[PDB]
Swiss-Prot record:
Ca(2+) binds at D153, D169, D170, D200. This is Metacaspase-2. Activated by Ca(2+). In response to calcium binding, the 280-loop, a disordered loop consisting of residues 269-275, undergoes a conformational change which stabilizes substrates in the active site. The binding to the substrate triggers the release of the N-terminal region resulting in the activation of the enzyme. Proteolytic cleavage is required for catalytic activity towards large protein substrates. The active site is at H144, A193. Optimum temperature is 20-25 degrees Celsius. PANTHER family: METACASPASE-1, METACASPASE-4. One of its GO terms (biological process) is proteolysis. The gene is MCA2. Belongs to the peptidase C14B family. Its EC number is 3.4.22.-. GO terms for cellular component: cytoplasm; nucleus; recycling endosome.
C-alpha cells in the first residue's frame, strides 16, 4: 500500500516499450449497457492509501493494465504503466475513496481482478454509476488498441480478446462518458500505441512540434453534436501533426504524459504544461505527441487539475 516505497514512481522504467500492432479482429460482442450497470451493482473498490479528503468531493478510480502474457500479443510495459500511474497519484496525494485495479500481472498489490472483457465492461459501469455533483472520476487503460470488423471500428483488446472479442470505442464512450451527469469531472488516459481513437469526444488539441509556450493554443471542434453532460478530459498520444522537414510502435506515451503533468509542481495551465510534456516525450524517444480531448472546449489558460470542472473557451463554437 506504499506504491512509492515499492519503487513504482522512481525505480521502474519510464522509457518507451515495444508495441507491435495486434492486427484486425473479428466483430466484437457489442455492449448491453443495461446489463453492465446491473452487473456493477454490488461491485466495489477499496481505498488504496490515506490522503486529505476534498470537502464536498469523492474520488473513484479504475486502472486497467494488460500485458497479454504468453501470447503473441504480449507487451512488456502496460502493467508497469499502471504501477507508475498509481505511485504518481499517491505521491501527489489524490484522495481516492475507492479504486479498482484490473491487471494480469501476478502478485500485484491491490489487484482487484483480471482485465477480461466482462470485468472491463462491468467495472467501467461501476466507475460512473454513483456519480454525484462534485465527484471526481479517474480512468487509466494501458494495453492494445486495434481495429475490429463491424456486424472498421477502433477498439481495445481485453486480456481474453481471443475468446471474448474486443470492446469498441463507441461502447467505451457509452459506458464511461455518456452517463455522467453535469458537475462530475472525469479524466481518462488511454495508452494505446496503435489506435488513434479519441473515444468520439467533440473537442481536441494536439500539442504538435510547432507549438510554443509564447503561443495561445485553443481546442478545436472535431465532431458535430455532443452527448456528454459531464466534464470529461482525455489524454492520449498521437502522431505529430506538424509536417516533417526530413506496424511497430512505442508504448507508454500517454502514461508518461499524464504522470509528467501531475509530477510538475508548479500549478501550470493546460497549455503550458502540454508543451513541457511534449518536450519530455521527444527527449525520451517516444513517437507520439500529447493529445488532449474533451467534452467541452477547455480554456487552455486554466490551471491543469484532475479535480476541477472546466472553464469553457467561449471562442470555440
Amino acid at each position: 500500500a506504499d506504491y512509492v516505497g515499492l519503487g513504482w514512481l522512481n525505480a521502474v522504467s519510464s522509457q518507451p516499450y515495444l508495441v507491435q500492432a495486434l492486427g484486425l479482429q473479428p466483430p466484437p460482442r457489442r455492449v448491453d449497457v443495461d446489463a453492465a450497470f446491473r452487473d456493477a451493482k454490488g461491485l466495489h473498490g477499496h481505498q488504496p492509501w490515506v490522503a486529505t479528503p476534498l470537502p464536498g468531493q469523492t474520488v473513484r478510480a479504475l486502472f486497467i493494465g494488460i500485458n497479454y502474457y504468453g501470447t503473441s500479443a504480449a507487451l512488456s510495459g502496460c502493467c508497469n504503466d499502471v504501477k507508475q500511474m498509481l505511485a504518481t497519484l499517491q505521491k501527489k496525494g489524490l484522495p481516492i475513496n475507492e479504486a479498482v485495479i484490473l491487471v494480469d500481472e501476478d502478485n500485484f498489490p491491490g489487484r482487484t481482478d483480471q482485465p477480461t472483457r466482462d470485468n472491463i465492461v462491468r467495472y467501467m459501469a461501476w466507475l460512473v454509476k454513483d456519480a454525484k455533483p462534485g465527484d471526481v472520476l479517474f480512468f487509466h487503460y494501458s494495453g492494445h488498441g486495434t481495429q475490429c470488423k463491424s456486424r472498421y471500428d477502433q477498439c481495445i483488446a481485453p486480456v481474453d480478446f481471443q475468446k471474448s472479442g474486443c470492446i469498441v470505442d463507441d461502447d467505451i464512450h457509452k459506458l464511461l462518458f455518456s452517463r455522467l451527469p453535469e458537475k462530475v469531472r472525469l479524466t481518462a488516459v488511454f495508452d494505446c500505441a496503435h489506435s488513434g481513437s479519441i473515444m468520439d469526444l467533440p473537442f481536441t488539441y494536439v500539442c504538435s512540434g510547432g507549438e510554443q509556450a509564447s503561443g495561445t493554443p485553443h481546442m478545436k471542434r472535431i465532431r458535430e453534436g455532443n452527448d456528454v453532460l459531464g466534464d470529461v478530459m482525455m489524454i492520449s498520444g498521437c502522431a505529430d501533426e506538424q509536417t516533417s522537414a526530413d506496424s511497430t510502435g512505442a508504448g507508454g506515451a500517454a502514461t508518461q504524459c499524464i504522470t509528467c503533468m501531475l509530477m510538475n509542481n508548479q500549478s501550470l495551465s493546460y497549455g503550458k504544461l502540454l508543451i513541457e510534456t511534449r518536450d519530455m516525450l521527444k527527449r525520451k524517444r517516444f513517437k507520439q505527441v500529447p493529445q488532449l480531448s474533451a467534452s467541452k472546449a477547455i480554456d487552455l489558460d486554466q490551471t491543469f487539475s484532475l479535480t476541477e470542472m472546466f472553464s469553457v473557451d467561449r471562442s470555440i463554437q
